Amino acid sequence: SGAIYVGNYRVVNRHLATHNDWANLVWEDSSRDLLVSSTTAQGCDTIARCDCQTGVYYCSSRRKHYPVSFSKPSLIFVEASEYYPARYQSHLMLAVGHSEPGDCGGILRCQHGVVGIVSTGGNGLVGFADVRDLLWLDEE
Ligand SMILES: CSc1ccccc1CC(=O)N1C[C@H](C)C[C@H](C(N)=O)C1
Numbered sequence: 001s002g003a004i005y006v007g008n009y010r011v012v013n014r015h016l017a018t019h020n021d022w023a024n025l026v027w028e029d030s031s032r033d034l035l036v037s038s039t040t041a042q043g044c045d046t047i048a049r050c051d052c053q054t055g056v057y058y059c060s061s062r063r064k065h066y067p068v069s070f071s072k073p074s075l076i077f078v079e080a081s082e083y084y085p086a087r088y089q090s091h092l093m094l095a096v097g098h099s100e101p102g103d104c105g106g107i108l109r110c111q112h113g114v115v116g117i118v119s120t121g122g123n124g125l126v127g128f129a130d131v132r133d134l135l136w137l138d139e140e
């Protein structure tokens with residue numbers, strides 16, 4: 001679990017969104033595993049606006065933050081899970097690292113701010129849903 005809190009927005013994995021998230025929906029995209037809802041209080045996270053390929057992510061199954069090198073956002077085939085069938089997920093970046101299903105939502109960040117959140121995992125791979133292209137998170 002985990003979310004990004006920027007301005008009056010809450011960014012979560014679409015597959016982990018709550019009823020309150022759907023009832024206060026701003027935007028959602030199943031192909032990216034992302035959902036954004038509105039919040040009453042202002043958040044403290046800042047979104048990175050960069051092309052960094054190195055950063056640090058939080059892994060809840062190890063209570064640890066790990067430095068990683070990650071690929072550029074791309075269209076990647078992801079295997080079937082309890083939340084989606086096997087399909088292509090867009091705007092996904094891969095890295096070598098530990099992940100388990102419950103690690104979804106952990107933040108990946110670089111020197112500029114939040115880059116994205118954990119969305120997929122494999123035997124020693126972790127995938128992150130990028131948010132750096134969502135410029136509207138910084139306004140309104
Ligand atoms: C950190 S996720 C993980 C880690 C290790 C092993 C397996 C996983 C699970 C995983 O890759 N998916 C299942 C998740 C319910 C939906 C994901 C998606 N965004 O399509 C894909």
Ligand SMILES: [Zn+2]
Binds near residue numbers: 048049050051111
């Ligand atoms: Zn950066």
